[PDB]
Amino acid sequence: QAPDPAIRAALQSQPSGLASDDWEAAMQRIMALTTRNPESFRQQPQANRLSAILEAVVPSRTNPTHEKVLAIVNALAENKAIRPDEAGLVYNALLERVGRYNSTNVQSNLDRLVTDVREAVA
Amino acid sequence: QTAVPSVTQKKFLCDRVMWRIPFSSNFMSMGALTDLGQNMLYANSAHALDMTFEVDPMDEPTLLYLLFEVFDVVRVHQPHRGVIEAVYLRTPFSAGNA
Amino acid sequence: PTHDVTTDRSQRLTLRFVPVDREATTYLYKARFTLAVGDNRVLDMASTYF
């Protein structure tokens, strides 16, 4: 079937490993609640043992603007509304328009579109 | 069978190289972030450094070219076309997040 | 690695053992030491040299 744009978008814009989004999985590592291996975190060097603690306690706010728009431009290609090579052009254009006019309403409507377009590819 | 008494002089020449004193517990390189420099990472202390060099009675004025190994890196953001932003960072000799 | 790779107590990297007893001959020459390798530490013999 046609791959889900939202899954594919997260497959090229989100850290492969752990990020602030995976906070619940991060806290299980730093407190040995993982069934796989609880003693992994205890044995890390102090440098990358504290940096993981600080992030988990106070999460870092990020910018989801680029992830949302990448989901849309990935969905447009699967409907062939744009040529695959045009994906670079469209991604940077939409991004600029949203920047030029960002605001809360805009951000929320981009979110509706992301859902709507998944259903549309289906 | 005529040799005169003599004294022995020793010296050495080590050119094309610079001395190094690695800031590690056992002077050994196990990684970029040394163990000793890893202690003061999140502590907000501030040491002071004093060093005394005893070199030689040279005839001409000279300089002591000294290096402090640091971490100078840069992250390069390219959000939009024609937009490039760099974030520099030196941790021991601070240089700002410009 | 931070903790379990190197110690924090006082420790000497290089030791110098003087001969405890020396015997000499016309051609032979014999020396005798006592290695006395500390405690809670391990010496690799491929570092000692007369």
């Binding site: 003693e39 044995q43 890390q44 060097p45 990358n48 | 990684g31 | 690695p1 379990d4 790779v5």
Partner: peptide, 26 residues
């Protein structure tokens, strides 16, 4: 699992289980 080995960010550096060793004149 004695991890007192250098890191590579995470996932401690390396080691091949089989490597303790032999050689002779042959």
């Amino acid at each position: 699992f004695a991890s007192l080995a250098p890191r590579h960010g995470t996932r401690p550096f390396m080691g091949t289980w089989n490597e303790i060793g032999t050689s002779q004149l042959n």
